[PDB]
Design a binder for this molecule. Structure first.
Ligand SMILES: [Zn+2]
Length: 69
């Protein structure tokens, strides 16, 4: 697995934290996604064709914003 951290914007509540996990989990190649609500960060484990930029697009499409750390 490869791993990447994303900084998250718009995650004001734990419902939205779950929304972000669900959106990231749908990305082909994602194996696991740990959303840290307190730290406004997601740790994503992946393989396959996943890229950091496909991950931040998933977050955008779900109605939030991410940036690659
Ligand atoms: Zn919310």
């Amino acid at each position: 697995a490869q791993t990447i951290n994303l900084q998250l914007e718009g995650m004001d509540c734990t419902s939205c934290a779950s929304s972000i996990e669900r959106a990231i989990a749908k990305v082909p190649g994602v194996q696991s996604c740990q959303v840290n609500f307190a730290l406004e960060q997601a740790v994503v484990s992946y393989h396959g064709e996943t890229t950091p930029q496909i991950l931040t697009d998933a977050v955008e499409r779900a109605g939030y914003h991410a940036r690659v750390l």
